[model samples]
Target: RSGILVFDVNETLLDLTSLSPLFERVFGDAKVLREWFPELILYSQTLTLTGLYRPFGEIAAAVFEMVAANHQAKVTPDDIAELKTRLTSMPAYPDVAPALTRLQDAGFRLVTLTNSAPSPAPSPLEKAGIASFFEAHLTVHSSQRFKPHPSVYDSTAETLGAKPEELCMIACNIWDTIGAQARGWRGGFVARPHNTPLTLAEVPQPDFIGRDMGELADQLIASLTA
Candidate 1:
């Protein structure tokens, strides 16, 4: 059977940490971004679990506004706009291109699945110059639901014309991996630090875990050829 590998863009392929300096400039606390990042993720999942849908950028903006309001910070509307723009232009993790190249060389069909918006105007994948690597780019915008929701996962498989079992999902978010696993897709975790671990209650555990994309690619190739 021909197999396919689906990748998550932010944090998995793109390193979003580059926004630290910008966050510090806006919030006056460099760690504000770090503090708000997990909250942003939690709410995204919460919205999905509650059967609501919002584009990631909109959710991010709302979360940032919430954070500022909670902290009584004086962030303006323009600040939020600039921060959102900065997020879309964030650079990829250093290892992404080489890792993707490794998987492509190993004969796995590669595609991208993201919870972010699909607009060609503001996609980080396009900004990072890795847009050409994917056979398809599936975004949650199409499903009108954030990830870890079954519909998004199902739509990704349908768009790729692949069976869930034959497609492996590689992502930095454990929850995302668990979501794919719950839907019967083999899940590979990229193990980015500070994110919560996937719990048994969420879904199936990851089939493989690695420090980054290069390691994940290595394990994927070995398994498929074995």
Candidate 2:
């Protein structure tokens, strides 16, 4: 069977963390952004596991609102709009394009699976200038669920007309990789030093791990050939 390599777009290929400075400037606390990010993930999974699904952007906005409420800080509608704009316009990490090129050259069909909403198709990917490399961009909105839910990963393979085993999931989030592994896909972790590693004992260990996309591409190429 031909293999498909599915990538998580946010931190894996694009560096969404660049917004941290913006957050710090607005909130006057750099850690606020870091702390809120995990909450966003938690809420995303919580919604999925509870059988309720919302777009990642919606969840992000909700969490931001909640955080602002807790801090008793006023966040206007304009602030939220600007935040989303900044996120959508974020740049890719330096290694992403080279890694994607290598993987594409190696004959692995590439796809992107994300939790972002449907309205902003191609925004982040086009900004990265590697949008053409991906044959498809699958979002959780298709399944009406956030990730860590099996259907999200399954939907990607389904879209590619492949089985879970024939697909490799590349993501920067440990929890996402672990969940994909649990769903029987090969999981490759793009280790972002900023995030905490999930306890993956109950799930299959990621088949590969690398600090960035270039290293990840090299590892995957070697592993597949071996």
Candidate 3:
């Protein structure tokens, strides 16, 4: 049997658009939500590269402060609270549950590998109501690095007791899948509207690219036998 199936939690499974209203209220523009997220991810990876690691929530809060400062917008404690709450409580994508069920029913050992920091309360996956589908919830905190860093994937394989090549990583971020591929894991891409697979001739590409979770699940089920 294939070892395990790993998922990226944020945009890959959960809908981040739910935070649009909070961004609009705080920044006077909903578009800043999109702008904020990329900055959050950039700094997370940046910290990982520089060997300076902070918790994901701390990075997020710091990024929020930076974005607010850049725009001369005042962010209060209430705003920060809202950001935290909205972030952890975002709803799952409509197709995610069905697709996860399909893969789980097919006897795949499902897990999540995320950059989200360890939280005392329920995680985003749990808040999204899909945490039950996963056998384990993995994070970058223990590795002190973000995705696209080879060590993170290697550590995940160690934690799961699976060979790198035996694991399949599904993510919406191209760089994430590429990172897993670099570590000898099978890579799959879910083409969320915010991002797509990279077309660089020299860069490694995902083994499977699907429009969404449903299509990706169908392709995976067809390819991997129970």
Candidate 4:
């Protein structure tokens, strides 16, 4: 229902489950992907709130080591190196390309907003071969703040030349949708594994909720074109 649809890159579009094998190999628990990811996000926001800044990759490796330490797992530097490589090369979800095509075919503008730092090397989206679909790849590096911080959302809206309410953000994390919602941006939730819409008394719900990217795109097209 918004003029432009903003996307969250990591789990929303790409398959983070691809990292489960790495976690399993190092930590002996495949689900450590789940644990390490949220911790990465937590500390990113914590740094932002504390007036600190760190590259997303730095935070990710630090969080991985921390999580490994918590599990008493001994992770070698080679394991961390594998993380950086695998992260940028993770495959996109099977449904992602078709859904993005559908949305773009419907004449919707699409772009990415991510916490990942800018790099000279090809990005994860590019490695996944989805980079051409996005008109822009925006990051938080400019703001020195992470998502759930209003400035990140607000600044992105401004960068895209639209009112906050005129952009809809689709993300796997409910907290991310809530963050965009805090900026009056319409929210779409891609309810991936281990993620669910929060129905708290005080928080607002996503304008659109779907089990996956394909369903979410279909719903958006059906609603907007109807």
CA lDDT of each prediction against the hidden true structure: 0.80, 0.81, 0.88, 0.88
Best by lDDT: 4
Better candidate by TM-score, 1 or 4:
4
TM-score for all predictions?
0.91, 0.92, 0.95, 0.96
What would the per-residue lDDT of candidate 4 be over residues 86-195, giving only the tens digit for each residue? Answer: 87778898888999999998988999998988877688898889999989999999898998899999999888889876788999988999999888888999988888
Model 3, span 84-178: residue lDDT tens: 88878889988999999988888889999889887876777877789999999999988889887999899998988888878999999988898
Clashing residue pairs, backbone N/CA/C < 3 A, model 2: none
- Over 168-221, each residue of candidate 1 has an lDDT whose tens digit, in order, gives 888888877877877879988887655545676635778877887778777887
Clashing pairs in 4: none
Error in Å for residue 169 of model 4? 0.3
Candidate 3 residue pairs in clash (backbone atoms < 3 Å): none
